[PDB]
Structures are given as C-alpha cells and as structure tokens.
Amino acid sequence: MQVQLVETGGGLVQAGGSLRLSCAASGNINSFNAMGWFRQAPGKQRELVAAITFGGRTNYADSVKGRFTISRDNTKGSVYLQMNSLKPEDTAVYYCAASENNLLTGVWHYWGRGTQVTVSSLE
C-alpha cells in the first residue's frame, strides 16, 4: 500500500487558545523522511508553515515562529503541530505533507486531504 496521510485535530478554536494537529502516516516509515504542515487560508496558495527532517530538525515560516511547534515520533509514524497563541489570521485548511527525501522544502510526494481550523476573534 502507498503511504497515506490523515490529519486529525481540526476544528473551531478561540483566539488566544491553542490546538494540536496530528498526522499518522500509514505504511512503511522507511518510504518517507521529511514531513510538513501546509495551510491554505481562503484565497491563498497552500503555504508551508513548518517542516521537520526524519531526525527532528525543524524550519518554520516567519508568520508562525514562536507560536507553532512541529515535532514527530517515528515509532508512531506521526508528526504533530502544536499551535499556540492562535489568531484569526491562522484560519485555514491545514494539510500534512511528506517527502520520500529528507529536505525541508520539497519535493512533497504525499499529501493528506486537509483539516479545517477556524480561529474566532474575541471582539
């Protein structure tokens, strides 16, 4: 079976709150290395906001630095996105992606179907 990615954890969240997204990759862990989270806000391209090498080294989009943390557990074939200090501007469809290779910028060979995260303002 080809590797498959299913994101969990999406939903509605209040601004200032937090949310963890998770993705298990099915199949053979040896067939992928780098993993990442993309987000597509309405009207926008899918934007890579966090990526992680097989060994755990990370890179973040400037727009999420200091607020989001990407991590992984290879014993569970999983990658996680802990999103703190959420803002309305973080509302988007969040996609997990994976690569056969171990670079933080592509090529993204495998994609989940995405999960919606909606951050509502307090005012």
Residue numbers in the entry: 1 to 123
Which lines from the publication concern this structure?
We selected Nbs against recombinant human αI domain using a phage library generated from a Llama immunized with the αMβ2 HP. This elution strategy yielded the Nb hCD11bNb1, which we cloned into a bacterial expression vector, expressed, and purified. Data analysis with a 1:1 binding model revealed that the Nb binds with a low nanomolar affinity to both the αMβ2 HP and the αI domain. Furthermore, known structures of the αI domain and our own 1.14 Å-resolution structure of hCD11bNb1 itself considerably facilitated modeling of the intermolecular interface.
Integrin αMβ2, also known as complement receptor 3, CD11b/CD18, and macrophage-1 antigen (Mac-1), participates in all three types of interactions. αMβ2 contains a von Willebrand factor type A domain, known as the αI domain, in the α-chain. Nbs are single domain antibodies of typically 120 residues derived from the variable domain of heavy chain–only antibodies present in members of the Camelidae family.
